[PDB]
Design a protein around this ligand. Structure first.
Ligand SMILES: *[C@@H]1O[C@H](CO)[C@@H](O)[C@H](O)[C@H]1NC(C)=O
Ligand SMILES: [Zn+2]
Ligand SMILES: [Zn+2]
Ligand SMILES: [Zn+2]
Length: 476
């Protein structure tokens, strides 16, 4: 039982672990970057307890990346807003430069929704994936979102508005698609996108025209310019004399011949991949499964590789105050981190986990230990109605009943994967949260992450340790 001796040994052991930390002052060969979108520190705590609910450890459970010796805090404000969107943050943590809301791979001179700015190369910021490529090393990206979503896009795109995932989105904002390249285009026609060995996620819709029909579902595509970008991608690999594979389902992914495959594009949905609690496990590969295949491919490169893996729908669930699903997405990513750790060598591989920004999730009192984190906390002493442990500062969960009272959540509500937990400030989609987020790191030079940093510091430190880019380097 958790008595005085128990806690003293628990602590003495942690101290013993801390004292035994051996620094790794050697170049990083590989860098695996995990990004939990909208994964606030509160999401991590809540998810630790959620996991504990499955394993029976409850509040004593540990999140995989919390076994790392190095954690840090990251300040996420951007050049025009206190609370960053996913685009400006991705530009910061992948290109090393902070920027305006809605802009990817361009600096703060950029005026959002203005394409001219994406024609000016002097305004370009370049990603750690670019840098790995310039050094002759392999790159890839896995995500549960559309592969043209802001996060993956930060590794390769330069656009004046994150909304421009395909040419139909450019036209929608009155811009000229002929000269304003959309993100899907940039992934297949430009560097570094065109050189990625592995591209996985969703978003097939931005890659083929309205006149064409989707693999799997037969839904017409979104492109309005007649371009079939997947076949463009395939033709490109083939004309280089390389083998390439396009897959769109789990069985096919797992059947891929790793040894004989140079390029891999796996697009498992028309749009974002289905959430953990709604996906067809037969048809959709999980985040860890995608991660495994990505690592299998990229590790063939003896000079090293960079891989971005995003737990992306964490954010989407928070936006709808759908906290149960948000926690399930989070754990899918926690499991992916474990998959990566078991497949790589920490003496040469940096594994970093962070968030782009948080969400306004809070953990209220006062439930007893071992209480399911999604359960009720107690009854309000002001209106006599139940309240949940988890709730939000912002979102559509705020609900005044027909009688003008605070909606009281039910047992049925709590079990419902679509139930929206209460918020303090009603909004159709919850805003992001501005609080500093966490960073957790293992491997070479993990001790570059000890304190509190601006969010754009991250890739500068990672470059130093991997010896890529044009800044200070360990090999320097
Ligand atoms: C967009 O930028 C260009 C280039 O400097 C400028 O000529 C144009 O008027 C700008 N458009 C708007 C709407 O500000
Ligand atoms: Zn985000
Ligand atoms: Zn994202
Ligand atoms: Zn968001």
């Amino acid at each position: 039982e958790e008595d005085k001796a128990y806690w003293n040994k628990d602590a003495q052991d942690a101290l013993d672990k801390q004292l035994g930390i051996k620094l790794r002052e050697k170049q990083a060969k590989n860098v695996i970057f995990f990004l939990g979108d909208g994964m606030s520190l509160s999401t991590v705590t809540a998810a630790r307890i959620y996991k504990g609910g499955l394993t029976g450890k409850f509040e004593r459970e540990k999140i995989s990346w919390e076994e790392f010796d190095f954690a840090a805090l990251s300040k996420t404000y951007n050049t025009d807003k206190q609370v960053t969107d996913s685009a400006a943050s991705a530009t910061a943590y992948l290109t090393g430069v902070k920027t305006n809301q809605g802009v990817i791979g361009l600096d703060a001179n950029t005026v959002r929704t203005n394409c001219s700015y994406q024609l000016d190369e002097s305004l370009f910021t370049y990603s750690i994936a670019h840098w790995f490529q310039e050094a002759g090393r392999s790159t890839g990206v896995v995500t549960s979102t559309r592969v043209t979503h802001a996060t993956p896009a930060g590794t390769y795109a330069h656009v004046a508005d994150r909304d421009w995932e395909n040419d139909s989105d450019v036209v929608h904002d009155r811009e000229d698609p002929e000269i304003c390249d959309d993100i899907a285009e940039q992934l297949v026609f430009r560097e570094p996108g065109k050189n990625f060995k592995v591209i996985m996620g969703g978003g097939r819709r931005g890659f083929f025209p309205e006149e064409a029909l989707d693999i799997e579902d037969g839904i017409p595509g979104e492109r309005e310019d007649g371009k079939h970008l997947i076949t463009d991608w395939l033709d490109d690999k083939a004309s280089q004399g390389a083998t390439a594979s396009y897959v769109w389902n789990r069985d096919d992914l797992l059947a891929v011949d790793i040894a004989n495959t140079d390029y891999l594009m796996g697009l498992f949905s028309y749009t974002h991949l289905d959430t953990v609690l709604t996906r067809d496990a037969e048809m959709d590969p999980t985040l860890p499964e995608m991660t495994k295949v990505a690592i299998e491919m990229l590790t063939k490169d003896e000079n090293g590789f960079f891989l971005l893996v995003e737990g992306g729908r964490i954010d989407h669930m928070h936006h709808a105050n759908q906290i149960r699903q948000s926690l399930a997405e989070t754990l899918d990513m926690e499991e992916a981190v474990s998959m990566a750790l078991s497949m790589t060598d920490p003496e040469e591989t940096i594994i970093l986990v962070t968030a782009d920004h948080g969400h306004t999730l809070t953990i209220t009192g006062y439930a007893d230990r071992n209480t399911d984190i999604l359960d009720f906390a107690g009854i309000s002493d002001l209106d006599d109605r139940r309240y949940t442990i988890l709730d939000y500062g912002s979102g559509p969960g705020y609900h005044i009943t027909e009688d003008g009272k605070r909606y009281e959540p039910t047992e049925e509500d709590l079990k419902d994967i679509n139930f929206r937990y209460a918020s303090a400030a009603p909004k159709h989609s919850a805003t992001h949260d501005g609080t500093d987020v966490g960073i957790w790191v293992n491997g070479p030079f993990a001790h570059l992450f000890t304190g509190v940093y601006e969010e754009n510091y991250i890739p500068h430190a990672l470059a130093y340790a991997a010896c890529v880019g044009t800044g200070r380097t360990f090999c320097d």
